[PDB]
Amino acid sequence: DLVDTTEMYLRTIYELEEEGVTPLRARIAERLEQSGPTVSQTVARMERDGLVVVASDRSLQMTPTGRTLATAVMRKHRLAERLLTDIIGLDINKVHDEACRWEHVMSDEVERRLVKVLKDVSRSPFGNPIPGLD
Amino acid sequence: DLVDTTEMYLRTIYELEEEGVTPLRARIAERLEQSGPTVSQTVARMERDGLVVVASDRSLQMTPTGRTLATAVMRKHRLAERLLTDIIGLDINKVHDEACRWEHVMSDEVERRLVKVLKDVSRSPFGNPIPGLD
After folding, report:
1. B92 and B105, same structural domain?
2. Which of A50, A84, B6, B31 has its CA 20 to 30 A from that of A124?
3. B positions 104-123 inside 8 Å of A (CB)
């Protein structure tokens, strides 16, 4: 899904960086059950919408308007997998693979809801941090 | 994609049904705001794998199996409202529209974990009895 697939790769770009690593398109086609060929359609499209820029070293640069939005999918991602865990108590194992889906359907007003409602924001149940204070 | 789309279709054919409006496509075009030339593409397409029938009385008449694919999506639909209000808190006239998203993610794994976490799973916010339950 276009809008959803931007979020999907903008999610891996954050996830590599935090992992400590260069957001190199290649890296992503082993991350994703995907290919170079398609991966360039996505970072070609994306960059022109203004989200990522292709360069050398680590290579892929999320723009000012690239960060603020994957910062979001990711806290959306780190806050729903906690609602599925802290509140419903989902088996764990399911929790990420499933919160990879609630991260697109969750809303900003439901975030504020979960900020007044959870007993620890801070870290994903897998430890490691949840960002957006906006 | 088009699986959550037959999950919208079966959810209005089942909703109109439940409210008494007999489900003749122009109502499906109106309720789902895509047009009716758009809606026969999809009603007719959900029929190739026998989910609906077009026939006099009821005009759309969803099969032993499409009706399963409707009762489900209406059960992760009422249960999402019951999350959204009962453990979260979204105003209320905001709560439907979120669950219309969440009725497509929300696994079996998840609303079965929900029924042990809510203290009245027989209610809807919006009157309507929660269909499914297993």
Report:
1. yes
2. A50
3. 104-105, 107, 109-110, 113-114, 117
- Residue indicated by tokens 């400590």: A20
Resolution (Å units): 3.0
Q: How far apart are CA B70 and CA B6, in angstroms?
A: 9
* B126 and B94 share one domain: yes
Residues A108, A126, single domain; the answer is: yes
Q: How far is CA A79 from CA A97, A132, B72, in A?
A: 14, 10, 26
What's the Rg (C-alpha) of chain B? Answer: 15
Contacts of B99 (CB under 8 A, 6+ apart): B77, B78, B80, B81, B84
Phi, psi values for residue B80, rounded to 5°? -70, -30
Give Cα separations from B71 to B11, B14, B111 (angstroms). Answer: 8, 7, 13
- The two structure tokens encoding residue B50: 């026998």
* Technique used to solve these coordinates: X-ray
Q: Is the distance from CB of A3 to CB of B1 less than 8 angstroms?
A: no
Do both B18 and B44 map to the same domain?
A: yes
* Number of cross-chain residue pairs from A and B with Cβ atoms under 8 Å apart: 45
Same domain for B69 and B86? Answer: no
Please, how many CA atoms are within 13 Å of residue B103, restricted to the half-sphere of its CB?
Answer: 30
CA neighbor of B133 nearest in space, from B122, B118, B119, B124: B122
My answer on whether B88 and B128 are in the same domain is yes
The Cα B75–Cα B89 span in angstroms is 19
Structural domain of residue A1, as residue ranges? 1-73
Instruction: With beta carbons under 8 A apart, name residues in chain B contacting A104.
Output: 105
Closest in B84, B98, B110 to A88, CB measured: B110
